[PDB]
Amino acid sequence: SEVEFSHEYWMRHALALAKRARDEREVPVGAVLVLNNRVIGEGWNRGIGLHDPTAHAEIMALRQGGLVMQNYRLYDATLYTTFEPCVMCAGAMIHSRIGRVVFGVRNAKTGAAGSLMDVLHHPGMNHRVEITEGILADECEALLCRFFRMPRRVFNAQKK
Template sequence: MTDLQSTDERWMRRALALAERARDEDDEIPVGAVVVDADGNVVGEGWNRNIAECDPSAHAEIVAMRRAGAALGNHRLIGCTLYVTLEPCAMCAMAMVHARVARVVFGAFDPKTGAAGSVFDLLADPRHNHRVEVAGGVLADIAGPMLTAYFRARRGKGGA
């Protein structure tokens, strides 16, 4: 395992812990995100808060990027890597482009709405003035089953 792979797994495990908080504390879809600066410091964390905040934009990535921007005192997250347990959707992917995130590392692929290569490839689109490096499938063997179990349990309750 390379140093980069080891680092990616370390931060993905933190994102997975945040996803568990989303599920266990808020009964939200278990997605967690961590923003790490170029020096390896966590500058923002978040988990899905759509239901708790009655906010359709409160995805884990958006929450983490808002906190990172506040911590850095800048709307640009230059040199930062965003770790998230699920492939970003179109909204989150474009927020990363606008924030100039350097790299996104995600866990589970999203074959329905993934915008980092599964359905759309917004992060690599050459028409944008910034492209985000993508690494997918990191600890997908943990992130994927966590999401599957959540949705199975919700369907059993008559929910989503």
């Protein structure tokens, strides 16, 4: 029962952007930055095509959010991403000072929001970013499993 402007509502737009990365032969990850139930930034992985090692879905949304906000600080915003953020994106989330990150499926190998580490809730950091996970995880995992050529029942098998 997904209501408009719910976590699943925004995650489905983020999943629609992940299909764009899939069509572009990239890692099928999409991201949507939401502030007061309004989209201020969208993005998907374009690193291979743009020759940008930082062109992850979360970065493309944060850069767009800063332009839309005319401010490199994006307080009280919520970032939706289909994949658990890496160290790069989680570190960028701290600098933009967003309010929460909502991701779908986990990166059990190198995830930096609970999996390999938790840089967002690291002690000593200038800002703490709240974490919500599991939103449409089955649909986010299906996209990446087909990209990485893996059956779904092996992606994060220890959590199942």
